[PDB]
Amino acid sequence: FTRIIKAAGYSWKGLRAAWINEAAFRQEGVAVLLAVVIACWLDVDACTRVLLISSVMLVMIVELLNSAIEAVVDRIGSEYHELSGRAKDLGSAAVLIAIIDAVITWCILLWSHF
Amino acid sequence: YSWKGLRAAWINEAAFRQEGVAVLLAVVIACWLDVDACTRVLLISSVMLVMIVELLNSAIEAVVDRIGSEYHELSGRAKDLGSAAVLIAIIDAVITWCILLWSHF
Amino acid sequence: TGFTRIIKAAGYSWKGLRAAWINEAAFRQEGVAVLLAVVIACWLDVDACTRVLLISSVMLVMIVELLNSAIEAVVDRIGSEYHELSGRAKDLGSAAVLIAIIDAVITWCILLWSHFG
Ligand SMILES: CCCCCCCC/C=C\CCCCCCCC(=O)OC[C@H](O)CO
Ligand SMILES: CCCCCCCC/C=C\CCCCCCCC(=O)OC[C@H](O)CO
Ligand SMILES: CCCCCCCC/C=C\CCCCCCCC(=O)OC[C@H](O)CO
Ligand SMILES: CCCCCCCC/C=C\CCCCCCCC(=O)OC[C@H](O)CO
Ligand SMILES: CCCCCCCC/C=C\CCCCCCCC(=O)OC[C@H](O)CO
Ligand SMILES: CCCCCCCC/C=C\CCCCCCCC(=O)OC[C@H](O)CO
Ligand code: NA
């Protein structure tokens, strides 16, 4: 059980860090709470309820990997002094597809539901 | 940041072009089928996930490259692991389509 | 396009999985929890929309942990060149893996508790 607390600390440290620093993460964190509430207050099925919640949760997972990747690029920024931003672009592409995915999910599921 | 990356993947990555095609295909096929929403959503978003992961694998490979590639076993490990992540995504999407359709028939 | 290449990429990927399993212990443990979970998903009498969600939620945990593992491998590569690491990137990666797990836990709960009365 010793490693699990070390890891969860890391995870929490990572999360607390994203929240202070990334404005978009604060927005997505907000989106998860609503997604939860809206999904729970609406009379829908579980398969719908999971997907309304899970699609949005995926946005967060991806903004979190993107933020990790951006953090690496920046460590190199300080030493190389090279501007190539190819990685940060690709990470942002990933986050966009994640968001689109959630939008589609929500449209399709709510459009069915209503 | 966002749009610049996708045009980059399409021009440079063949697999991304292949998955990007699969994404609209999946969408068309998903809408063409008479299924419920949970079904339709899962058909699309599974293929979409493959694309999302492929993009992250692509970012990572790009960072590996920005550092001089030289020779190192932590560079290759990264590209390989990232390469594996895309595979589980593809495997996942493949299973998904099976389960939904074997059922559908 | 060049389709001969698909086996080459598939090599790399397999190399990557073997890599994760040998080196990352957390990959082994979650993989155990995940493989167990997947198997249970196949034996449960649920609908297809339910079954897919049970499997894929858990599979994402694997997919996310694998990207974290790629990420950390890059941090380790920088570690050789530079001296001080913030740990900030590796932390975010650990966060991503957690949110993945929580999602799978939430999925499974919501789907089982709902579906089972
Ligand atoms: C129906 C059942 C619903 C179950 C519930 C679903 C929960 C969603 C999962 C994760 C949320 C992650 C939130 C991330 C918060 C990061 C920490 C943070 O913001 O810290 C504040 C900071 O310390 C100020 O100084
Ligand atoms: C009354 C009609 C029925 C209710 C209809 C919805 C009403 C509230 C809208 C959205 C909730 C949040 C989920 C929206 C899905 C996409 C979320 C997303 O991807 O967010 C990206 C992120 O916030 C970028 O910073
Ligand atoms: C119940 C039903 C069970 C169904 C079981 C299905 C098993 C076979 C699955 C997929 C085929 C193999 C696809 C191999 C693709 C490898 C290419 C790859 O991973 O490319 C990533 C690359 O690194 C670029 O970023
Ligand atoms: C349409 C419904 C499909 C549902 C089932 C599939 C779901 C995954 C989606 C696309 C796989 C795309 C595969 C592209 C080729 C393998 C991946 C790759 O990276 O290949 C590199 C190679 O060099 C390239 O030729
Ligand atoms: C009605 C109540 C139902 C309750 C249902 C609860 C269980 C949910 C199942 C799987 C989630 C986790 C699957 C993905 C793997 C996570 C990895 C993990 O948990 O690792 C622990 C670690 O290995 C320890 O040493
Ligand atoms: C029916 C399914 C069969 C299998 C049953 C398995 C049950 C596991 C459930 C919950 C564990 C949740 C534990 C979450 C611990 C924190 C994870 C974390 O922080 O992971 C980050 C780390 O860096 C990663 O490498
Ligand atoms: Na690649």
Author numbering:
A (entry chain A): 7 to 120
B (entry chain C): 16 to 120
C (entry chain B): 5 to 121
What does the paper say about this structure?
Diacylglycerol kinase (DgkA) is the smallest known kinase. In Escherichia coli, it is responsible for the adenosine triphosphate (ATP)-dependent phosphorylation of diacylglycerol (DAG) to phosphatidic acid used in periplasm membrane-derived oligosaccharide synthesis in response to osmotic shock1. The enzyme has long served as a model for integral membrane enzymology, folding, assembly and stability. It is a trimer with three active sites of the shared sites type that exhibits moderate positive heteroallostery, random-binding kinetics and lipid substrate promiscuity. Each subunit has four helices, three of which are largely membrane embedded (H1-3), whereas the fourth, an N-terminal amphiphilic surface helix (SH), anchors the protein at the membrane interface.
However, in our studies of DgkA to date, we have crystal structures that include a total of 10 trimers with density in the active site for bound lipid that is variable (refs 12, 17 and this work). Mapping these onto a single active site makes a convincing case that lipids reside in the binding pocket. Their variable definition likely reflects acyl chain flexibility and lipid movement during reaction.
